[PDB]
């Protein structure tokens, strides 16, 4: 099953905001691949101020590095990934949504699909792809 | 001088009639004064807070279908996408 995860990672080091997002992406991707999964795409959304001063545990966050991960995997390890995300202090907010594959095997992320690129083949364009 | 609302501006290259230089034309014009209407899926716009924010009030209240003018299908998808954006930490 294709699952789109949208994580809101906290920024604590003002000099290298991307480090914590890198560590989180590494962890989630490692879990997905080591539990018979596939990581179709990692779209690096930028740094954005949160709509409100959202609170996780005791720390209060005003901005976050947003990031997206499209990955094909099973339901059980998907729930495991969600559980790990929820208890992790690094992830302010997390959300996993199914992307249906009933009709087309390959589908892009919500962002590219909204732009107009239905599939990842269109994302990487089509030359010598008729082989 | 003449307040702008009290003056009618004929655009360039447009035909006109003598009625156009009249207050009646201004009143008639006053009387008869995007992507989601283009066949797109609003649910796909759930991680896009700006385009969703186009369809809410200053306080964040979803606008009625009378205001948005969307179809019932796309109106429902827009409401669902806006609520999902609210839930996931965006918007």
């Amino acid at each position: 099953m294709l699952y789109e995860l949208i994580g809101l990672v906290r920024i604590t080091n003002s000099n290298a905001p991307k480090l914590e997002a890198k560590e989180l992406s590494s962890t989630i991707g490692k879990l997905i691949i080591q539990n018979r999964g596939v990581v179709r795409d990692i779209v690096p959304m930028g740094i954005r101020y949160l709509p409100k001063i959202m609170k996780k545990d005791q720390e209060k966050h005003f901005r976050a590095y947003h990031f997206l991960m499209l990955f094909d995997s099973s339901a059980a390890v998907q729930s495991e990934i969600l559980r790990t995300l929820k208890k992790d202090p690094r992830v302010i907010r997390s959300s996993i949504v199914k992307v249906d594959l009933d009709k087309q095997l390959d589908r892009a992320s919500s962002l590219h699909r909204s732009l107009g690129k239905k599939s990842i083949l269109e994302l990487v364009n089509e030359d010598y792809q008729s082989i | 001088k003449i307040d702008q609302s009290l003056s009618k501006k004929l655009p360039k290259g447009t035909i006109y009639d003598p009625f156009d230089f009249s207050m009646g034309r201004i009143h008639l014009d006053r009387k008869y004064q995007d992507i989601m209407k283009s066949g797109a899926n609003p649910l796909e716009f759930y991680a896009r807070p700006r385009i969703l924010s186009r369809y809410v009030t200053s306080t964040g209240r979803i606008q009625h279908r009378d205001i948005t003018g969307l179809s019932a299908k796309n109106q429902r998808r827009l409401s669902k996408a806006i609520r999902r954006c609210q839930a996931i930490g965006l918007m």
Binding site: K18, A21, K22, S25, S26, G29, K30, I33, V39, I42, V43, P44, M45, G46, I47, R48, L68, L111 | R48, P49, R50
Partner: peptide
């Protein structure tokens, strides 16, 4: 794993074009 490290480094460590809405 190698492809994961490569892509992660590309997207984050490298200053690639990011999908940030203007």
């Amino acid at each position: 794993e190698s492809q994961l490290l490569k892509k992660i480094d590309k997207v984050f460590n490298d200053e690639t074009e990011e999908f940030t809405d203007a």
